[PDB]
Structures are given as C-alpha cells and as structure tokens.
Design a protein around this ligand. Structure first.
Ligand SMILES: O=C(c1cc(=O)[nH]c(=O)[nH]1)N1CCN(c2ccc(Cl)c(Cl)c2)CC1
Ligand SMILES: O=C(c1cc(=O)[nH]c(=O)[nH]1)N1CCN(c2ccc(Cl)c(Cl)c2)CC1
Lengths: 306, 306
C-alpha cells in the first residue's frame, strides 16, 4: 500500500544523453543509433535570439562547428539537418546503448517522466503532466535544454518531450521529438504567454479511486449524478468536461473498488462546492490532477518493465 | 525555476537488481561483486513467520535451495551466510555492472530514492524521507521486499535502505545494507507499532527557502525570534526541536536569499499559529518536510553526477 509520485526507471535513457556545443553554447542532446537530436536554438547567438532566421543561421554552419561529447569520447559529426524545431546531427558512431524506442506525440492530461540533465549528465528524474494549456510545470535551471520526457511500455521507451524554454510565469515549453511544439509557442526569445490552465478532471477522479484503494473514504457519499449535471458544476470551477471515453477509461478502477464512476463524480461535486474542511486525501490538502487512470492502476496493481 | 519531488537517476542501481527464490517464496536481491544481498525472511514458510528461528531455518538449507536469476541468466550460489537480518548469497559470477558504491546508515530526516522492484525488475523510482519514528512512507505491493534505497554522491552509489515489511498503519520498515533495522522492529510477522511521528523542522525551513527562491514570498514578515522561543512553539505542534547545527546547515540558503534563519523561523511560527488561510506555497496547501537543505541546494543550483 501507499501512493507516491512515481517516475519510470531512467537507466535506458541515461545512456542516450550527450553534450552538444556550438560556439559558446552548450546544451543536451539525445543520441539514438547514429543521430543526435537537440533543440535548434543551440545555433543562436545573443544577436539572433529575439528573431532568429534558422535557415540562414544553419547554412552558415559546417559539421565541424558542432562538438558532441558522450562522457569523454568525442563523436564526429558527419552531417546535419533541421526537422521543424529540432536539429539532427548525424555522427560516425551508432550508440551501442540505444534502447528499443519510438517517438510519440502525447495529448494534454497524459503524464511522463523527465530526466533533467546538465552538460550531458543526468541530474534527477521526476513525473509531470502535460497541462491543458500545453505547458509543463517542470524544474529546470540554466543548461537544461535538450532534457527529454519519456514513458516505458513493456521494453520500449516512448520519447514524448524535449525541453526548449521557460516562460515568464515559470512554467516550461518544448516539442515532441520530431520538433513540433506543444502549444502555440515558438523558439525565439520573445515574451510569450500560456493560455489559462484547467484542472484535469479524469485524473482527479483516478486519484480519488487511489485514495479509496488505500483506505481514505471520508469523502464518499450515497448520491449519484449525471454526466450533464456534473459537467455543469465542473465548468464553474475550471475543470475539464468529462466525456464518456473518460468514464470507460476509469472502468477498471470502478470495478476494483465497486464504486460507480458517476457515484465518484457526486463525491467530487461535493468537494468542489464545500472544500475539504482541513481534511486531507492521500496526504494532500488539494485535489491532485497529475495521475492518470493508468498511473493509478500501475501503482496500485504492480506492473514492471523489461 | 520550478520545484519538484526529484529522485536520483536510477540506472546504476537497475543493473544490480536480481530475483531470489527459496522454495515457493520469491523477492528481490541486490547483486554487487559476487554477493547477492536480500532479506533473510525469504527462508521462511507460512509456519515460520509468527516466530521464526533463523539459525535453525538456515542450517536446514543448502546452496541449491536458492535460485538467483539476473534476467534470463541463472547465477550459481556457492555459499551463503547471514549478517543480522540480511542474507548474503555468494555467487560464481561477479556482477560486471557493479558501480562504485558504499553502504551508509542514515539518520532520521535524511532523504533517499527508492527503486521499487518486482521479480527482479525495476518498476518505478520515487523520493522519500526516513521519518523520526524510523518508518518510511513508501509505495510497495506484494513482491516488493528487497527493493533498495540509495543516494548518489559524485560517482558513488550510497545504499542506505533495504525493504522488509509493511506495518499495519500502511507505512514501511526495513534495514540498512548490513541488516540492522531502522527503529525497534524485527522481521517476524507479529503486529508491531511505530512510535508517534513528528514533523522534520529543518526540512520545512529548507522548503520555505526554496519557496522564496521561486518567488513565493507572501509568508515572510519583519519579525525575528530566538531559538528558544521558536522551540517552545514548535514542541506544541509536534515539530522536532531546532538545533544550532540545523541553523548552520541552512547557512548557504540564508546567504543566497538574504533572509536570516531566525527570521525564517519567525515566519514558520506564524504559519503554525495561524494556518495558511487557503493559500499555497510551491503548490502545496500543507507544510512539506521531505526536502533536506541539500535537496534544495541541489535542485535550486543544479548539481549533476558521474
Ligand atoms: O538553459 C536555459 C533554461 C531553461 C529553463 O527551463 N530554465 C532556465 O532558467 N534556463 N535557457 C533559457 C532558454 N534559452 C534559449 C536560447 C535561445 C532561444 Cl531562441 C530560446 Cl527560445 C531559448 C536557452 C538557455
Ligand atoms: O511483499 C510483501 C509486501 C511488502 C510491502 O511493503 N507491502 C505489501 O503489501 N507486501 N510481503 C509482506 C511481508 N512479508 C513477510 C514475510 C515474512 C516475514 Cl518474517 C516478514 Cl517480517 C514479512 C513478505 C511479503
């Protein structure tokens, strides 16, 4: 029993991180087979950042302007190209630690682990969610660009995020591994604003089911509601609307605890309208929305990886 | 910027986990050089658990009653012995992935990362603190015994915890890697109770400094207090007393923010006496005590590992 913010084991990703330097700028890269992936803004200088023209900046570089290091070894760059907002550096050596992997573009509400890195070296791992406004609430300092987010499915690493920048509100923005930003952001040092964020309802319900599984039941009641009555109250508190697909996703947790989804929705309705009265759920005094239904199942039923 | 519950990268530990079976009982082991370390209760059957006599139970076993698997490979056990509450299984092959390591017995209030494992396979990583009552608030299911806790210092893995059991309150108890329990527990399936827990004051203050570093300042005030006046109020709320060594430990965070420790103590005094008024700090509505001063520095100044 117990319930923690649990990240995936990071070892398969640690062996893919490298350091990329172009000029006086150093950040992290991801080395898979014989390609190093990194944010294209590594090629900017201070003069370029407010409004870079990346096609111009790249035509002015050659292979030897890029220094790639994996620990002590230097990797010889033998070609370069740009895909959307990522740079792809072809190197002369295939990474012998390349895991089975794929690239996935995730949707808002999904969770992933971040391996935060500096100078090509892993510093720490943590779990976060992609917010509805396509930012993440990360923890990143100077030098962290190029750190990646991932999930593990069986034996396969699904890369879903590469870190590019911090916004003025202190939250973070980046791309999938094909270089497409999540959200309406661009890789220039202009001032950009994230849209208003909402609470991820299906995740809050998954976490209430985790609470029940761990013996925290004080918030339950005998009422029920309809999807339409619930969504009317949720909109007033800036919660995402609940769909029938969400209800079906929660099926396994409803079955395991014997509490119907629409009954759990009635409890959540009461908690939105009356607050928690200085009581806690799973050790929190706020409603938590960065666990998916799959996170809860995984952690309350015990799945491992190869 | 940002602040997360950040674990150490787990890759150096992942390569040390193995599966140990004795009879019908399987749990996890830690394979370092040519020794596998695991909880000694792997040798108990249902008849033994209420009151095992481990010296008797072990004399009745031979090397071949122990099945050790590292993935697909089976390791041949060529000797066995007991140290306190851990079993040490000598095997015929030295683990080629053995990191630089040491064994440390930690003190209450310190933090570490846990690599939760099932059947020798890593399932997830999370950060926890050793509580003042020598339990940890973990997340562990059936099959998790033998999972380890660790820190990383430069290039060295410091192992500090091996998981042995869950107590009736849902919290967890285990040993250092020389087999000595933390706290007054024993490895028999009797009912054992943990002592009353307290809040780790020096960690709460470290987390308030992290808040200031990230722009959350609403709780600050101009007052100050003395160590003796603070400790009088803290005892009333079940907070650990603050010592001069704690004050000195917080030195680097005091310097970086310009707020004296005893000024921060005056703010904490007000928060204990008046509550948080439905305001939050770093995204929490409770005072958080599982970050040490070193955790905060590491995360708000950017240290990596080799
Ligand atoms: O290393 C960090 C960083 C990341 C973070 O998350 N937090 C933090 O404090 N620093 N930066 C800030 C972003 N920068 C940058 C350069 C050129 C362009 Cl064109 C763009 Cl868009 C961004 C690179 C260096
Ligand atoms: O695998 C878990 C487990 C661990 C956990 O943390 N949570 C959970 O639900 N299950 N167990 C429970 C403890 N058990 C045990 C056997 C013999 C002795 Cl003599 C003792 Cl002391 C303990 C081994 C199997």
């Amino acid at each position: 029993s117990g319930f923690r913010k649990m990240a995936f084991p990071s070892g398969k990703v640690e062996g893919c991180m490298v350091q990329v330097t172009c000029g006086t700028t150093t950040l992290n890269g991801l080395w898979l087979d014989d390609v190093v992936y990194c944010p294209r803004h590594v090629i900017c200088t201070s003069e370029d950042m407010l409004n870079p023209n990346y096609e111009d900046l790249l035509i002015r570089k050659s292979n030897h302007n890029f220094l790639v290091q994996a620990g002590n070894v230097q990797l010889r760059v033998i070609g370069h190209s740009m895909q959307n907002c990522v740079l792809k550096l072809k190197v002369d050596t295939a990474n012998p630690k390349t895991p089975k992997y794929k690239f996935v573009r995730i949707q808002p509400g999904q969770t992933f682990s971040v391996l935060a890195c500096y100078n090509g070296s892993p510093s720490g791992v943590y779990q976060c969610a992609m917010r509805p406004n396509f930012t993440i609430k990360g923890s990143f300092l100077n030098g962290s660009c190029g750190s990646v987010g991932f999930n593990i499915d069986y034996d396969c690493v699904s890369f879903c995020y590469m870190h590019h920048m911090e916004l003025p509100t202190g939250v973070h923005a980046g791309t999938d591994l094909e270089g497409n930003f999540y959200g309406p952001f661009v890789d220039r040092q202009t001032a950009q604003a994230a849209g208003t964020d909402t609470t991820i309802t299906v995740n809050v319900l998954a976490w209430l089911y985790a609470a029940v599984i761990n013996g925290d039941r004080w918030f339950l009641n005998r009422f029920t509601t309809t999807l339409n009555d619930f969504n009317l109250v949720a909109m007033k508190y800036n919660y995402e609307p609940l769909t029938q697909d969400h209800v079906d996703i929660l099926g396994p947790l409803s079955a395991q605890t014997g509490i119907a989804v629409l009954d759990m929705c009635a409890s959540l309705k009461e908690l939105l309208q009356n607050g928690m009265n200085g009581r806690t759920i799973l050790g929190s005094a706020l409603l938590e929305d960065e666990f998916t239904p799959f996170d809860v199942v995984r952690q309350c039923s015990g799945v491992t990886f190869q």
